[PDB]
Amino acid sequence: ERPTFYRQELNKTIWEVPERYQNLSPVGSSVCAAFDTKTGLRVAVKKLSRPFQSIIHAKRTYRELRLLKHMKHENVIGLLDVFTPARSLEEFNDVYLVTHLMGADLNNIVKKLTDDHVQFLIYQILRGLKYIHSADIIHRDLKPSNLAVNEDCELKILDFGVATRWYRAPEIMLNWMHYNQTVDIWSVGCIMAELLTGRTLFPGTDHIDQLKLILRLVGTPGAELLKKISSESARNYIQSLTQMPKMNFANVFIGANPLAVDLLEKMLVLDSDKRITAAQALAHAYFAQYHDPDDEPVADPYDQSFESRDLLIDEWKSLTYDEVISFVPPP
Ligand SMILES: Cc1ccc(-n2nc(C(C)(C)C)cc2NC(=O)Nc2ccc(OCCN3CCOCC3)cc2)cc1
Ligand SMILES: CCCCCCCCO[C@@H]1O[C@H](CO)[C@@H](O)[C@H](O)[C@H]1O
Numbered sequence: 001e002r003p004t005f006y007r008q009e010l011n012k013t014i015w016e017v018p019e020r021y022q023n024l025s026p027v028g029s030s031v032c033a034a035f036d037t038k039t040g041l042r043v044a045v046k047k048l049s050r051p052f053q054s055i056i057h058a059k060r061t062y063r064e065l066r067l068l069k070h071m072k073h074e075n076v077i078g079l080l081d082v083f084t085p086a087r088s089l090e091e092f093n094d095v096y097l098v099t100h101l102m103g104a105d106l107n108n109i110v111k112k113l114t115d116d117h118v119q120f121l122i123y124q125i126l127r128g129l130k131y132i133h134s135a136d137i138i139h140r141d142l143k144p145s146n147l148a149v150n151e152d153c154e155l156k157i158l159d160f161g162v163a164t165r166w167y168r169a170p171e172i173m174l175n176w177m178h179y180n181q182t183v184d185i186w187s188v189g190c191i192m193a194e195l196l197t198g199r200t201l202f203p204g205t206d207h208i209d210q211l212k213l214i215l216r217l218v219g220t221p222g223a224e225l226l227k228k229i230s231s232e233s234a235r236n237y238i239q240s241l242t243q244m245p246k247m248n249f250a251n252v253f254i255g256a257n258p259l260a261v262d263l264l265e266k267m268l269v270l271d272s273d274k275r276i277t278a279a280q281a282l283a284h285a286y287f288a289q290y291h292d293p294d295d296e297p298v299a300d301p302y303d304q305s306f307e308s309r310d311l312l313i314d315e316w317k318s319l320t321y322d323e324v325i326s327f328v329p330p331p
Contacts (some may be wrong), residue, residue, distance in 0.1 A: 005085050013047065016085040017096065021045060028160070033101050036080070042101040043080060051095045058316035061095060062306070065323050068097060070135065070302050075128030077148070077158035082327050089321050102148035106191070107162050110144060112198030115257050117153065122192045123290040124155040129188070129278035132157070133181045134298035142187035143167040144194070165207060166200050167191065170214050171272060173207040174234060182275040189267030196256050218270050219246035225271040259286040
């Protein structure tokens with residue numbers, strides 16, 4: 001049966017939720033922390049904003065719900081519940097997502113950390129990324145504020161949807177036509193470095209300053225990378241730069257665990273084809289105390305074919321409705 005709903009206003013916004021959820025309190029703007037009476041858990045409830053206003057919003061709504069329904073891994077946000085107060089498709093206009101409430105984000109603890117903490121936090125990030133990447137999902141926006149952490153140091157990857165640019169792989173800023181999942185490894189590299197040093201690795205003021213700072217560390221592209229650049233304009237510009245060697249990372253990251261330094265060198269490589277993968281990184285010596293090859297699961301395949309489709313607002317709306325109706329909560 002349909003739960004009984006109750007209405008209230010929170011920060012200019014109306015909230016209509018199952019009575020199951022008590023004590024709503026805003027956190028971020030929209031999201032409320034709440035008490036879930038059925039499980040005894042503190043939960044986060046996200047009310048989507050104008051989910052079906054346009055085709056763009058409608059497809060984004062569907063994209064987010066479909067993805068969240070798929071995620072079933074300890075180090076990735078999961079869906080505890082999804083509901084709408086609507087009793088039918090015709091009046092369906094609002095979507096609420098329920099997830100576990102975590103203590104804070106990584107931006108609000110590195111606002112620096114011991115090596116054992118770095119090992120454990122980066123391990124869990126990689127473990128979640130192995131999972132996301134095995135489903136052919138690319139995060140694309142990994143940064144400390146997209147990582148939620150408890151006082152246990154348990155970590156989950158999320159995407160709320162501290163500048164994004166600072167953690168972005170250089171190919172994304174060169175507007176590269178295609179890019180692959182190791183863009184996320186670049187981001188992990190940036191995050192790990194910042195945890196070890198307590199300073200943003202590459203605090204660029206814009207995308208040009210960003211690449212400038214990046215090339216300073218990793219050096220200008222070599223012959224082998226240049227071979228793979230199809231853009232005339234980019235090739236010419238890159239080749240016209242004053243050439244710089246890759247820095248020695250052990251001197252950049254002075255006093256850091258040598259295993260950590262080694263890992264960083266394997267993550268922060270300009271040529272994306274040469275970066276360590278998440279699955280390979282888990283087997284790196286730096287994570288020797290946490291690595292367990294039989295507890296680093298992959299994901300079921302995830303069908304993203306809908307991304308290539310151009311549908312009407314009411315079609316994306318109906319598809320999202322079906323997804324709300326078919327939701328099966330975790331045990
Ligand atoms: C359009 C869109 C937007 C976001 C996503 N997305 N993607 C992912 C992954 C699987 C790739 C990491 C996750 C999301 N969506 C997502 O994390 N939504 C979400 C859900 C709840 C949120 O609550 C913010 C409050 N936090 C802080 C307290 O601890 C946990 C909850 C914030 C964001 C997918 C599509
Ligand atoms: C001045 C900075 C130059 C940045 C060069 C970025 C190189 C990124 O690496 C490239 O990633 C592509 C996208 O997945 C792959 O198709 C290429 O094979 C790979 O070399």
